[model samples]
Target: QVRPRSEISPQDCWDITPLYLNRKAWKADLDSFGLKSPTWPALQATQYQLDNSESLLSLLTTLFSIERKLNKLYVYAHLTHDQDITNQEGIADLKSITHLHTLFAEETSWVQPALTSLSESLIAQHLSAPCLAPYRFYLEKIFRLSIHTGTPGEEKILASAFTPLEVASKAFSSLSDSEIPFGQATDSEGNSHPLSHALASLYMQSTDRELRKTSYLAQCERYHSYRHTFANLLNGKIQAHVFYAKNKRYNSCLQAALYHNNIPTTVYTNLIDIVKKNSSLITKYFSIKQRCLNLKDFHFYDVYAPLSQEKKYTFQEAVDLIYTSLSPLGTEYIDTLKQGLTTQGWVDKYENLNKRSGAYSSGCYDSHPYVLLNYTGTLYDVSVIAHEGGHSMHSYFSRKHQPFHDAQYPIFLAEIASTLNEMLLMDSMLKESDSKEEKITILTRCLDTIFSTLFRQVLFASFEYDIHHAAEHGVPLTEEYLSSTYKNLQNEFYGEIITFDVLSNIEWARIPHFYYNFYVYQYATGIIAALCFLEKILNNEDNALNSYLNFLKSGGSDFPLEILKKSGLDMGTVEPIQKAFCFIEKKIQELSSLI
Candidate 1:
């Protein structure tokens, strides 16, 4: 049996004492060096004073050490709260660490500007300098952001201002998880249960059509009740993005997002194009679902119903199955995961009273990557384990190979690692399942995965882009404005096939991710990237596994697309997206045969 959050003692929390110890030791060095507020200016001045490479390297190392320890502190506290948000102490600690973290972030925001100035000076000296050659790529990347780099004071202000700007998302999270009242629904057996995040999985699985409809309506209506709150949160986030973009002199939010990721705006535009053109493919899959389920009219609630009944896996069985399924990735990957699961104590595996809703993978460079799952002995729970384990192992590989400065991979590549594991696990299950009904079950789940990751995310990303663009044009992002725009997109994409009602338009309100600028597209991009990689590895293509391992090790050393390109996946092209859609089509065909 999986232990609940409250049942797990603090002693069992993966020992972050080592990181605390490191921080304590480093504070002495920090104090002795008198690295106060003027540290930024002093370091900036060192470009001329430091003639030797060792001196420059030493300075960079010191900066990274301090920044990294602060990051670890922040991650540890945040993860603890994420595991059980109802814990007053945990929530308080997370907020306190987050504030301190803002201070640390502000202190280091000048590093980029300093690097940019140094790069410009070096460029004027020409490329013939020996020191410049060794650091050319690093310098060029810094220089690329020259236009975005603000004055030191401006950067500091932006950094400090970021804390309050981020509160919009936090407010949305609190409202969704704790404040909303989703009412109640009766299941197939006529048992009434309150609809909350804890029972979200069960609600989705409810067989009674009326119950599913009621749950869906209740879920959306709750958000509708809090529509003003959600709209305010969304507007605040848009204002934050616009503020940063204008302050940094970027033309728009898209440029701001691309510039920060070191990716081109074309990538975002191209993804939107692919999804827009291929939306019919998604509707086709939905049609298949309708036909398979023999429904008179396919509603939103019917979207997630299991295609066929299949036995669920126990938690231990899930662990065994997932471990065995992912073995093809490599023995090293499997063994490391075994240690994390069995002895290293990297997972908080169950839910108890006051435990947090949902699941996530989190840890710091100095500690074993930890996962929090509210396991309820379902196949979905098993998939969650595999998904989160992907993230943990990705962290493990990156931390093992990269220095502290580059160990934290960017968010662009983050979803790819997790989704790839999910694809691999599903692939393994499909191959091993002997029963047709079980295969259908897996395929149906695959459809849900594709729908959520690829289709829904693309729609959400498009909505976000439109809203941001409107904000850039000085238009108000009111509830009615966003709703009308969303309704139009819904009509264009799914209106012909499925009913587009007021409840459907309220979809935007429920998604807290709208507060995260330009983040949803990564989900669509990641699913495509993961599918591409999975196809290659499953084919036993030469060096495919090694290339993936290398990609993981690259961490934040390069842009996400560049890292994936090195692994033989060119996400800048449409091939991966088409391939993912094709895979979805194939699954639908396979499920049709079984059902």
Candidate 2:
């Protein structure tokens, strides 16, 4: 008789078997698509069906079948390699599906042109049908943004260049994560330790002030040594973004980046303006921190030192705590999260040799969501569980409510769920804590979360805007200019908190998000939106819980900002940003009173 898998091993592992029986099975689906064939017929036929709603519906419905199948195969390839990055077969399969996916992009590049080729009146006639409601938003998005889309030839050239466009980020991550020698630091005990990216991350937050300074400084110095090379990498990325902006007839790189998502320049500008306006709060926090530590000298290195005593939790205990923390959302929400934590295999809970680094939640529409985490049994690790858990549950609800075509949410909305989970986790933990130590630990973590995610990203957004905006204006992006500009922002944002360090000017060269084309701003905005939702949901305000759940369920069925607006939050307005900063100030006060 076969033994139950869990009985044989105490650990829970994800069941990849549902995706494919083996490599042979995975390829069978691949070969069925017949990438070698003239891949245009099915795609071209869908273009022809754009004339009528029923025909378009038939075409979209048919493409959903292809997308579902393709999603399954792609996810299997990814999950395979994610399980063991060293699996040659898995590597090949992942690359294989990616290649096929790009080819699909090339084949289907005509869809937008086909839709745009129609008259606005004719397009309105098609969207007027109730039958096409599932895809109405997407079709409108296509039509509304078609002005940025060039001729068919231009579209195909850009579509086919998708693989190359992403190289700067991936290549930079590889170097920063693996190749660089970010040197070591020793604690007060005088024991020397060699450092890597992983080591610096853990060391930078050491309770020992000396070690924290050492590790953070070493990492910066190493990057600063190679600052010229990094400046080149980022400059090339800005160039690529600017090149695409001009080619697509966009007014600027910022407009080109935000046009597809319907975000306005004022939103980006106000994010910067609001953060600068509220810079005093951050400055005050830094002052409070210096007093807490009772040290006169403070630098960026001093910023990461934890003010709270450590609290440990086993994985089970942490999950139990998170379950308790999320209780206010509703019994069903908490219950679903518990199942995802323990029974549904939504999480892979530990690190093994060659396993993927960091944590992320990902899955296809047809599969249960999966989160990969190297859970270190810290309270912060527990927060990560809730963070990624939010993503998994968001995926869970979206796929449940939406057809495959519209199942995935945008990255802008994606961070909202994950960040909201974090906010809720912190609130729950604080409420449950009976002692000063536990409260300090959680509160300090939240402050760090706010600093790193909110303020810093907005700063990066400003930096990105300046560089690209400069490029658009025919200004040079030389290393000296970039470094000096970054240095000035550091001074302006931090405001006499620390003495100037010329080395930190290289910080711009180290960010991969800059390569992501105005993407970091969303992380800043996401938490602002999350804090807005958290305020109402915690207070049981009106239909707040229901509204949040509805937002998650709506997925990509509506515009991202519109979804937040329906939930009683508006990202376009400054009120949410102001409220979010006020919430941070409130946290700082609470921690001060408790101390």
Candidate 3:
């Protein structure tokens, strides 16, 4: 019997009380810090009193404890909200967690700068001290940012300013997710349905051409209605980025984002360039898809329709599939995942009234990683399971291998681990299945992953770059400007194949990521890099699997690109992105023959 779509009970959920336990402990720690310290002077002087080997170790441990606790609290609130944005309690909890987070950020923002000021020479002089070598990576990360670390006053001001920006993002999310009314849609069976999740799902699965077109237009129209409000939110976010970049003396917002991850803008530009150069590949894929679907005309709405009959996987089957697919990383990795998925209860699996809309894997360093899924028991849901499981396993390894300070990897490298899992899982499915239909389904899904993650996201990133670049030049990013720019890109990508509609122009308004300050490009970069890594591992290249596993365990101990380089992949050049496109092209050709 198939398990019900929802979780069996709260006991089945990942144990997050460990994080709350540390949170309670940190309340006491914060009080202790407050009692002993009120200003930088107190902290600076007391820093030396705790500068010895054992004391420094204790200090670092305490700091990690606090950091991990905060991460747990934030991840809990955020994941809960994500599962159901309509949950008032979840929203309130998220707000409270943000406040608690601000408190910690305000209090400890000085620690990194102070540590950085202590000098690499001083750290090296004490290198031979017990356990200090393990902290070298931690100290070096801080030292690298010494030039950008704001003064005490500036840090306080910046910390306070962060609240409003954070609120703006929350506000935009509320407008899009909670407050927006999506109206209604007419399904093929002459049934009226609310344009909610059911309608969104229908758009992807509907054989009725008109319904898909209506759904897409209605969705875009909803965003168009709130265009001005979203534009303001985006402007506010861009201004925030500009302020930080200028204050930090970086050349642009892109520079400020890449500085911490030690990635270059050239990498981002190269991704865009590679995609543009291979635009014909995307065109060819779509052209093949059009012939396979037997459609006289193709539109954006047709992009997600299943190229084969729907395939289903039970929850237990999905678990087995994901585990077996990832077994190439070794038994230890697979066993760790099994323990987390089964005994450790790392998933809140099910959908309920007002539950969140998508899937994600999240946890703090001290807690077992948790995954939230709205499982509909489709092959796509299994893919999501594999993807999020990848994240959970990566988090598990990073937490186990690195200390608190380095356990939380940056968002740039975060997707690589997850996407690699998806690729490996897809590869396993392809190798195991002899049925042409299953092969086509898996191949189509793989192509969609590449299209959505690599191609679409890069296009979105390019749109963002244009907007921000224009804004930086004192150009207003009004609705007209945004709509026009997006339309131009839509035409560029799909002009020859699919009609560019007015509804598609407003698609830019709906992307919350534009407010994320040049973050979407990482999705492109990550998928390409993951493809390269996955190909190497699939071919059983020497040390490839081990290198990829080490990359996952690296966390924030090194620059994200540096970690990838150590794993024998480089995003600095166009080779990875070009190779991924070639892989997609080859798969498209294979699918064409199979079809």
Candidate 4:
């Protein structure tokens, strides 16, 4: 059993005091914000106050300050809650901040419509105002999105629809996290322990074949029992996505998602086309793994089995490896990361009762970024450290260099920094080690990441496109339809190398990203870009290190695609995808030689 939060050492915890001294302080700050004043009434009359630069500046100042504070409040609340979901204090904070967020949206609902309705002359005049200099790009973003902007009343209606529309995701999360009747897995020795998503993750990597099989089958069976419920939740989510896209007059959910960042639909399409064309890479890698594991047969449950005896590390050792592996990134980058991981308390490092299952990096411009991790010190966990650390450093750089409004990077670019660090860590470990077992361990982990992140994500991206396209064409997303579609895609992608069972069809139900509205493709695109960037930096190509660092600092100041171009990679072309394939081929050859 996991230790309770009270038993966990403070040394292992993240110091969120940087975000707030306590909930009382946070509530005080939250209560101090008011959109309406006796004199200006910015929330109620901000639309009418846009007549001059001075008035516009006052309105902008008030709204931007509220937004910044809201961001800080939300981050603190969510982070505190995630560390222990049962914490009443954190739950109250989350609810309070959430209500304020909704209130903030309602109060300022007219701003975008009013900005969009401005005459061309007035807009240009406001753009040139010295007082509005910090917000030129911010104002431009509103104008760029104005094609989909609605009337003030319509915008408010749309804002009100959001919480209602969130029902599916919220229900799905609650059911999956708390309501599932997860049973215990019995091992060959007749010892039984409770099963959970996190435990299933660890068990799948076990060398005990029967234990792996039973845990895998148990997990699938549990989810499969709720197949219809899961399918309905997913359908509801898809409809919500469709609702917003159609309401905004976008062509499809994909376009609605990509259009915010001005990304071309072709980038998403190109990834599916390119990966499908080159999916032999997936078949080839699996073939190699099957041989290495010396299995007469391969099955779905065998996928995550280790290629070598697993090596363990302490949390301290994991930190040392990450710091050394990232040495090529220059001292400042590694040093800052080290301080955050060590003394600065940027990470909640170990598993405690009721902590979140997976890992993520989160922060707002008002404070340093933070990472939540359940550190068990496997090689994979070490890689996770590198991965989440990449995200933290990216946030750190973006906030340090850009203004508050411009500091948040688009999701399209979010994974590149993280994936780049994973690749670098794999490369560094491969170069520094001499043991064949160590080499095989590192190479297998690397290949698994490429498979999961690049190839598997593209498969998911393809599935999202198909489902949404089906829904758009008025096809009902029934359990039969959803399961069969997933079954067919799995058959096409994996072919006959592995056996599939009935529970395999319900795999779609377990994927939370399906509700993310066309978000997984970035993982595919991100790894491709990361691979290209890694090659340049490691080969010491001209200014590659500086260019990559500058890319981190670029933030959301410019379009994501343009920022990549400035960093010397282009997603519009197929060259980077081809580069990723080449890298995959090289790894397969190396792994083959070693084994």
Which candidate tops lDDT? 4
**In model 2, where is the ten-residue run with the lowest total lDDT?**
1-10
What TM-score, computed on C-alpha atoms, does each candidate reach? 0.78, 0.86, 0.79, 0.82
Candidate 1: residue 499 lDDT (0-100): 66
lDDT of 1 by residue, 1-595 (tens): 5555657775344444444454444334334434345544434544433434455555565666666666766776676667666788777766766665566667666556665555555544533445445444454566677667767787789989978877988888888888776688767677777788657667776667767877887787888887777888888888889998899889899888877677788888888878888778767878878887788788877778766773577666887887898988888888888778766778776676666678888877788788877778887788888999999999999999986667778888888888889888988989998988778778877788888778787888788889989988989888888888888877767765786445778888877654367877887888898887777678787878898888888878777788888888777787777767767777777776764
Overall lDDT per candidate, in order of appearance: 0.75, 0.80, 0.75, 0.85
Choose 1 or 2, whichever is better by TM-score: 2
446: Cα error in model 2, Å: 1.2
lDDT at 502 for candidate 2? 51
Error of 1 at 396 (Å): 2.7
Q: Rank the candidates by TM-score, best first.
A: 2, 4, 3, 1
Task: Find the 10 residues in a row with the least total lDDT in model 4.
Answer: 34-43
- Can you write out model 4's per-residue Cα lDDT over 1-595, one digit (the tens) per residue? 6788889898999998988898888888877864332422555663556768888788878878878889999999999899889999878889987877887787787677778877778888888999988888888877777678677688778889998988998899888888988877767786776798999898888887777878888888888899899889988888888888999889999999988778899989988888887767877878788897788877788888888866799999999999999998989999999999999999999999989888999989988889999999798899999999999999999999998888888888998999999999999999999899889988888898888888788888888998988988879898889999988888777875777866887888888834478877877888899888887777787898898999999899888888998888788998777767777888889998886
Going through the candidates in the order shown, the clash numbers are 0, 0, 4, 0
Off by over 4 Å in 1: 1-55, 66-113, 116-119, 122-143, 150-205, 218-240, 310-319, 339-378, 474-481
Better of 2 and 4 by TM-score: 2
